[PDB]
Design a protein around this ligand. Sequence first.
Ligand SMILES: */C=C\C(=O)N1CC[C@@H](Oc2nc(Nc3ccc(N4CCC(N5CCN(C)CC5)CC4)cc3)c(C(N)=O)nc2CC)C1
Ligand SMILES: CN1CCC(c2ccc(-c3ccc4c(c3)C(=O)N([C@@H](C(=O)Nc3nccs3)c3cc(F)ccc3O)C4)cc2)CC1
Length: 280
Amino acid sequence: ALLRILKETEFKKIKVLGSGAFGTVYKGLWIPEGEKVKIPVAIKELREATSPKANKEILDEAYVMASVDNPHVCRLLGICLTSTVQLIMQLMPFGCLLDYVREHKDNIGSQYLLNWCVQIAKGMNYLEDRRLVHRDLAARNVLVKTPQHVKITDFGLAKVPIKWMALESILHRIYTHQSDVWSYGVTVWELMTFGSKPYDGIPASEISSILEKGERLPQPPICTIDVYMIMRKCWMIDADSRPKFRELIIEFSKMARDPQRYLVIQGDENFYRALMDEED
Ligand SMILES: */C=C\C(=O)N1CC[C@@H](Oc2nc(Nc3ccc(N4CCC(N5CCN(C)CC5)CC4)cc3)c(C(N)=O)nc2CC)C1
Ligand SMILES: CN1CCC(c2ccc(-c3ccc4c(c3)C(=O)N([C@@H](C(=O)Nc3nccs3)c3cc(F)ccc3O)C4)cc2)CC1
């Protein structure tokens, strides 16, 4: 009952937020039949052709992605299956952290960057308890609800991010909770470099070759060595040598209580009912 099957006549698409090869994402509003409320939602219309055989496969995975309950993980709210499947989730008025961190390059402090690292690790730690592998962790897949509250989305999507995958994922298609730790390190690198592109100048056809010869992402200018060594431990060849999500929460939470020691940032020195693009 956590996944609600909506009728096509009870939600509206207003504006597209972006498109691609897996579907178009819209901004919209949801009014359940009877209830007298408006709910801002995001609607992702797929390109997958529906059918009694395919509809059963889509629905069964949509029930597990509606059963997550963590402050830093996004929950799937509803599905509409007609001649085209439409997925409905809550609208995150601030967008994704890649675009956010890139647009506020010159005004993000050490407290926000480290707190984002703790919040993302908590959401990935909960997914581990629920035995769900994300498989595509990146700064583009972290949504911002408020500047002090982020949530991870689009998990369990293997129903290609070569530069975010662990080495065992590139070579043998192995996706585990420890390969997610690798993707977490790259995501942290994105935040600490204010949205830079990883391995800039290297083709994706060479990423597997370049990692085994000993290459890693460089040390971000604002990070001390203590922050960088955590990120590098996420990129070890031996999967069981990478840190756990439990340990990452603890170590990054210790650094958040004295943020200026661990991040050198230029000019570094309740939230109830807040929006940004829910208007214009
Ligand atoms: C990270 C971006 C990205 O990859 N994509 C692909 C499609 C979209 O994916 C979404 N989007 C949303 N909702 C959403 C997207 C974008 C925004 N805006 C905010 C405002 C805009 N400006 C920033 C500041 N300037 C000054 C004025 C406004 C930047 C982008 C807002 C909401 C959602 C959702 N609500 O769940 N999900 C996805 C797919 C997971 C963008
Ligand atoms: C070719 N033949 C066709 C059918 C088979 C198939 C099986 C399952 C799916 C399926 C099911 C469910 C989802 C997804 C995909 C998915 O992409 N989903 C996201 C999500 O919707 N995001 C959003 N953005 C903005 C608005 S909705 C998502 C949202 C969320 F809130 C939490 C987690 C999550 O993964 C959910 C598709 C096709 C494959 C073989």
